[PDB]
Design a protein around this ligand. Structure first.
Ligand SMILES: Nc1ncnc2c1ncn2[C@@H]1O[C@H](COP(=O)(O)OP(=O)(O)OP(=O)(O)O)[C@@H](O)[C@H]1O
Ligand SMILES: Nc1ncnc2c1ncn2[C@@H]1O[C@H](COP(=O)(O)OP(=O)(O)OP(=O)(O)O)[C@@H](O)[C@H]1O
Lengths: 884, 49, 884
């Protein structure tokens, strides 16, 4: 050759040169050569990189300035550099106020500009995978107050263990306030780690609750205070209801009872108090869900489900529901089971008599075809003038004003009994953990906390402010401002109230003007998930409520493209869909591009859809992206596209909650309970194979809810060293069972955790290593974990999300029709925002598909960064697991 | 109790069998006697036992 | 809408209209409407297809003619038709003399032209998989003659069974001509199907051979003739050597020996005779390989391999080879084992004394570094003046003219003993089958045939013409025209002679002028295969012979792109490579596009390669196509690209023989023999898992060579009905073993035949079904079947193909440099021809990669239309298998 190499790049500056000298040194890692002849930029030793800078007026300030702004359009001769890990330099430039050009933003060549524009950077000569990247001590006291609430045992179990782990004595105050006022070893017993064994499954309260008359007065409040100082209890944890916590709050302000009658007064000077709501009511204001609320809701829906599971004219059914102060149970049961009329204290009849209101609503439903009328009566069922409405009152109206043979079903204690539902076990446990930390982290300047849940996230809220707010609601009801009372309840309550009345109301003129009425379609994509049918039911009934035309695309994208599966949704045909499992519409894993994308687009324009709602898992996630990217070709797709994640796995990015995961979690939790109970009957372990695919979410949560010793997850895998360590753990566990409760042992193994170390292989290794001291058996239930009848939570969440989806389509349709009616569509930012994923984040938000697909997902064969890391840590803590 | 547990289990099987799965081979653990399997078959509407 | 449908297309004709009327009716299926108003073309009833033709002068003859020719360049407004199975119409148009335009030629839209041009046809509205496609008796006598030749038993086994199957009595003439002349039950015994059990393995001849002095005269020839008519033998099959068949040929012409001394003379009037060459010599002229030739060649190479497997200066080794008339064994052993000097009758020293010639060649080899000198002496080793050259003669020259301690190795009877090699078993068997058919199909007007192999294909050749031609060769040797004698031998012999002397001659000035000398590179792609190293050895030594620069690309495309693995080939470094197993260069399954195609192209130009030789399987096949398709981007790739198929599987289209398949076949055949022998020792079956992937070639051939009862192949699969049928076959087989030879039973199952019914599963089913009457055991050798030391056939074929590859690159390089030195490369037909696959077809031919990839292969995950269908039919016939 003759052009043997590349010595240096020569740059000419106007007259000033320094701006570029600062750029190439800070941004590129160059350095000025020692002793400059006039007033060379080399990179480093053992190299050949050089850039020459001259101040001779050969390049104009006017030309260079115009060229810099000219480049701000996203052609000119340039120079490229060989540089490893371009991703780091791109961030350093962008954040330094410099624009950059790249290949997939993953990335291949990077290109920026100085006073000397177009300074390129390549990560290699020609196309190939790139050049490798170079170089505190206090004793705790737990108590439960008020009526039995499922999840009280899981909470106490958590407090006992968390406190023990954090190195402090835990005392269980038996018979709540009574035990606290009476005191002594009789009521205040020191609790050990093994003493709260298998309490997850146990219903009610093993500690016990009692109404203390004395604690209502300063007489008892003082006696209780003495007993704590005598027992050496430095901190109190109350798990109970409204008054149960208000009384604890009053005890907090009244704590300065120095009473001369100083060593003890010096040490036990401040009251470390923490509250957690142990109620089925869900009446407490600063939390979204109280402990026991969803289990109670579950008992109610279990009864309604059985009632609906029959034939017949002239039949009405009354479900008498427990819950004195709030209407949450009534409203949510009503929503989950699509009840005709609900009698709750927050929404009494106003413009007309409750009997006239009921008869009108019931009548309209029967007239349109609905033969099984269900009426839910709250304990707090009331009229405008605060007159309580009884069941018999309601029964006589149905029997005498209408010709209906009415049969009353009353839950009673059923609504407090049984094991806590997966949500209550998971949340009560985490709340127990938090209550301990809160109590330890407490300082005299910090206001006494109450543990609360705020949109699936554990938080700390001041107990005084929560106690005050609940009273404000009761005041609004008593002062007859029901509209106000409703707004005072949590944002979920107000949304559910709106959701229910709208879905309950096709049989009334539309709520939107003719012009604002649209054509919205719904599809199910992926494997079935509890709530798919509820999302369809809620969306169709809400559409009818607004005046929209709800369309159902039967059997996914394959059904549309190959068979024109666009079908109308009739109110009578969708009767009971909210309670049905699977997908009535039909779901499959077929992607829009695996079906004809052109044909999907053709039918979208033939039927003139103004929006689309996708209910499904990861395939429905890819589907959104495939439909979004095809917008350039097809104007028919330039409409709002919304995804409501529905997978038992919870592998879809955008949400922290996927529809059907609670239904699945609860069915597996019920399965694991029976397996652990069986292990408890025989020195045996069970290796339980878990579903959810490449997502370790279900095994994580099932470990927490069931008390499994280990859960093997796909994100971590299964190492031989961890397996040997865990087997030795089992060896020691059984050697230490001599004396304690025999609760049984579980190991949960997600099928994807290891392809080699399988459930069956793992179990044979346990037997080999056990050397006859115990045995191991597998439990492989299979891809049946889906479950039939969806959980009340799933039915409720699906309703909420379906409505938020329709409402988003309403908002964005006007903007879309600009891109729809126009060619020359250059795929802007205003349009990409309409293809979105509805999700829970800490906040219920719509996230554009672009950011979640490109950045938040393993788009490839994995189909899945996790959030459940803390849940994992706590479940290993509670079971004594040692990781590596 | 077992037959009740099985019928219920299979009801959930046939529901999950409605782009996932079609036919299910449910394994019944009733020892060396075909009683459990036979009974379970009748009550679940199994094709072959 | 307003444009509600499409009624009809209206076409205007000049004045004549009829040409188009004939086109749309014959080609499209239209019909003229009954009773025409002036002097409508509708398709069919219950439809809406119509084309109106008017003779009004609205379209000009000059314009239309110019438009038709204008379109002959591969834009205008057109009409498309909905039509199912476009493939059928495209063929009908093309063959009817009409040009067509299509998408992948698989195909999506079809477009042709009439007097009314651009008549389009679509197979659907928008992109999706297309619209579904609408709606004779004579008794045979076998004998063997001449010296023991491996494969004589497999041949007789074939004749006995084939003849039995075709419904005719088979008699085995013991002691050849002696038995034929003596006659009687003593020498002419009736043979049964079970009497030839396990003869595949048996060495020599179970019937026996004898030199009959009497048959040389008319005295014996007459006695033999009588014995055939007395035994009622209507047809004779001779399996022997040259004279053995010449004597049969003389007996054929002398057959009209009516001799009165008429019932018998009327019936037994004509001699049905068929010949097959049973010789180690390979001296017979009309066949490429005689039965026993490759087994004998194998014995020789086995000895030479052991000789080479040691250290040492002043050492020479003489291999005394059996083979009196021909030099084929000497030449092929010399080629397969890279011997220094060979003494064969066809190529005696001419321009100088044999001692001077030998010493020069041997000397040059030792001087350049080769320490182990191997000299092969033929039985027919001769000088110019036809003086026979002995071993001692050769020994003294090496011991006295050079200072070498010479050790002679003489094979003797070793060269006739042992079992027949896979090639001999497969070929002798098929020849036996053919000999029977030939003998039955024979008529008095048909000249007596001899069964011959012509480039891996069984043919019939007139025995007289083959006898005459062998004499012509002997005449040429005796008349001292050796150059003539060489040309008179088969085309493979002349090529091998050329191949050997060129590869034997780096140590002599190049055979090409400076200008004609090139830079040729070689790669190994895929899994290793016997002959990969031989192809490299032969190509490098041939390159040095021509004056080319042979380059080796180490470790496939990954080694080149990621590591610059271009390495030179030194003659001394490649010593013994032709005999080594695997790939010394290094092979992998990495494709040019999975490695950097730009980087491959960069190094191709950096080193300025004038051609490329790919030695490998299906990945090397895809590689060719990937390199061919990248030619538009890279001028560096616009050079001849040649693929020499190398796979144990034989899955590559273009050849009927892939390098390493004989090595593999033989190793598996040796394995199956031991397994069958073991089955024979115990009422037992063996299910033997076979390699080769999705290709059923190896199991097909192993079934024939080993006498397996069944072979389960991936092309057919394994049905439950066939499995039950085959198990019942085994049940009956063992029930009938009472009395016969216990030879053992095998079932060969290609791993890919069934994913569910696996070797282990199949065998457990056999045991279940067997009901204790016999058992089944598996034999799973694994991916070890590759084999070490490649077969002499593989070493020899690889040499031949490597040379044909270099010679193709020589021919095509000049044409390529036009496309190489030029941009504006539009990817013509002259260039696509240079990217080729070297192969055996019936003929040795180079096939352009384009036709084999697009049309002859399952490009996808299968990696594979079969030719071995007949072999399959025969192996089922010979084992009594009943298909479905
Ligand atoms: N308690 C309820 N249970 C079920 N649906 C209800 C209930 N109250 C109202 N709805 C829904 O709202 C629709 C309208 O109710 P209504 O006409 O009585 O007006 P309203 O503003 O809710 O009543 P009011 O002004 O008396 O409080 C009903 O027909 C029904 O479908
Ligand atoms: N019998 C042989 N064995 C091995 N290589 C041989 C033999 N005969 C010739 N060659 C090869 O051919 C080369 C050239 O041969 P040579 O110098 O004898 O010319 P030739 O045409 O083969 O001889 P001649 O005219 O005497 O038949 C040798 O150096 C060697 O590569």
């Amino acid at each position: 050759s003759l052009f043997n190499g590349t010595s240096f790049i020569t740059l000419f500056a106007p007259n000033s040169l320094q701006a570029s000298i600062d750029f190439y040194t800070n941004f590129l890692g160059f350095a000025i050569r020692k002793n400059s002849n006039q007033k060379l930029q080399l990179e480093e030793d053992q190299n050949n990189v050089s850039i020459q800078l001259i101040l001779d007026p050969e390049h104009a300030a006017s030309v260079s300035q115009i060229d810099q702004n000219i480049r701000n359009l996203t052609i000119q001769s340039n120079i490229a550099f060989k540089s490893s890990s371009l991703s780091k330099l791109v961030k350093l430039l962008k954040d330094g106020g410099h624009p950059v050009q790249q290949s997939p933003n993953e990335i291949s060549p990077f290109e920026v500009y100085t006073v000397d524009p177009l300074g390129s950077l390549i990560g290699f000569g020609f196309k190939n995978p790139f050049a490798v990247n170079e170089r505190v001590r206090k004793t705790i006291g737990v108590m439960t107050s008020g009526g039995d609430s499922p999840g009280m045992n899981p909470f106490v179990r958590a407090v006992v263990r968390a406190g023990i782990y954090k190195g402090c004595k835990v005392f269980c105050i038996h018979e709540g306030y009574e035990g606290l006022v009476r005191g002594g070893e009789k009521y205040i017993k020191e609790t050990q780690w093994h003493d709260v064994r298998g309490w997850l499954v146990e219903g009610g309260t093993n500690i016990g609750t009692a109404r203390c008359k004395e604690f209502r007065e300063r007489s008892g409040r003082l006696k209780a205070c003495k007993n704590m100082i005598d027992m050496g209890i430095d901190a109190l944890i109350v798990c109970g209801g409204d008054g149960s916590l208000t009384g604890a709050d009053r005890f907090r302000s009244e704590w300065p009872s120095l009473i001369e009658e100083q060593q003890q007064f010096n040490t036990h000077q401040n009251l470390n108090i923490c509250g957690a709501v142990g109620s089925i009511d869900n009446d407490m204001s600063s939390t979204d869900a109280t402990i026991g609320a969803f289990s109670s809701l579950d008992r109610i829906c279990r009864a309604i489900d059985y009632i609906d599971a029959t034939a017949s004219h002239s039949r009405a059914f009354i479900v008498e529901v427990m819950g004195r102060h709030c209407g949450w149970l009534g409203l949510l049961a009503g929503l989950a089971t699509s009840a005709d009329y609900i009698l709750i204290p927050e929404k009494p009849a106003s413009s007309r008599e409750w009997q006239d209101q009921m008869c009108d609503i019931v009548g309209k439903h029967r007239a349109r075809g609905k033969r099984k009328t269900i009426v839910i009566v709250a304990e707090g069922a009331i009229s405008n003038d605060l007159s309580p409405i009884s069941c018999d009152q309601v029964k006589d109206v149905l029997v005498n004003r209408l010709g209906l043979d009415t049969r009353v079903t009353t839950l009673g204690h059923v609504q407090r009994g049984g094991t806590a539902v997966a949500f209550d076990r998971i949340y009560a446990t985490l709340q127990g953990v938090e209550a301990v930390n809160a109590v330890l982290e407490c300082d005299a300047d910090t206001p006494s906390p109450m543990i609360a849940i705020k949109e699936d996230q554990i938080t700390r809220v001041p107990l005084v402010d929560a106690v005050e707010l609940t009273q404000q609601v009761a005041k609004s009801i008593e002062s007859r401002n029901f509209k106000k009372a409703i707004s005072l309840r949590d944002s979920e309550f107000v949304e559910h109230m709106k959701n229910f009345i709208s879905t309950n109301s096709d049989h009334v003129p539309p709520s939107l003007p003719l012009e604002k009425r649209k054509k919205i379609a719904i599809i199910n994509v992926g494997a079935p998930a509890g709530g798919m049918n509820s999302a369809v039911y809620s969306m169709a009934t809400y559409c009818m409520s607004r005046g929209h035309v709800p369309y159902a695309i039967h059997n996914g994208f394959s059904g549309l493209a190959r068979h024109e599966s666009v079908r109308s949704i009739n109110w009578l045909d969708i009767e009971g869909w909210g309670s049905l499992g699977g997908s009535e519409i039909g779901t499959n894993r077929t992607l829009p591009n695996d079906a004809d994308i052109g044909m999907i687009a053709y039918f979208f324009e033939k039927y003139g859809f103004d929006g689309l709602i996708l209910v499904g898992g990861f395939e429905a996630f890819i589907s959104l992206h495939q439909l979004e990217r095809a917008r350039i070709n097809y104007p028919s797709l330039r409409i709002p596209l919304v995804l409501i994640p529905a997978t038992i796995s919870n592998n879809v990015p955008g949400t922290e909650y996927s529809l059907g995961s609670d239904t699945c979690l609860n069915s597996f939790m019920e399965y694991c309970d029976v397996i652990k109970q069986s292990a408890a009957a025989t020195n045996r372990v069970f290796v339980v194979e878990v579903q959810g695919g490449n997502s370790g979410y279900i095994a994580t949560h099932a470990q927490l809810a069931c008390g499994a010793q280990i859960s093997y997850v796909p994100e971590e895998g299964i190492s031989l060293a961890q397996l040997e360590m865990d087997i030795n753990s089992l060896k020691e566990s059984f050697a230490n069972d001599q004396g304690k409760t025999k609760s049984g042992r579980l190991i949960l193994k997600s099928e994807n955790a290891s392809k080699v170390l399988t459930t069956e292989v793992i179990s044979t290794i346990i037997d080999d290593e056990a050397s006859g001291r115990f045995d191991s058996k597998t439990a492989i239930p299979g891809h049946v974990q889906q479950g039939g009848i969806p959980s009340p939570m799933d039915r409720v969440r699906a309703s909420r999300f379906a409505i938020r989806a329709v409402s988003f389509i309403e908002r964005h349709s006007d903007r879309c029709q600009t891109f729809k009616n126009s060619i020359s569509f250059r795929q802007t930012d205003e349009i990409t925002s309409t293809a979105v994923v509805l999700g829970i984040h800490k906040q219920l938000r719509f996230t554009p598909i672009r950011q979640l697909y490109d950045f938040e997902s393993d788009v490839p064969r994995r189909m899945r960064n996790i959030f459940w890391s803390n849940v994992r840590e706590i479940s290993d803590m509670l079971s004594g697991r040692t990781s590596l | 109790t077992c037959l009740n547990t099985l019928s219920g289990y299979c009801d959930a099987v046939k529901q999950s069998a409605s782009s996932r799965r079609r036919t299910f081979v449910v394994e019944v653990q009733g020892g060396y006697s075909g009683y459990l399997a036979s009974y379970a078959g009748l009550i679940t509407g199994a094709l072959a036992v």
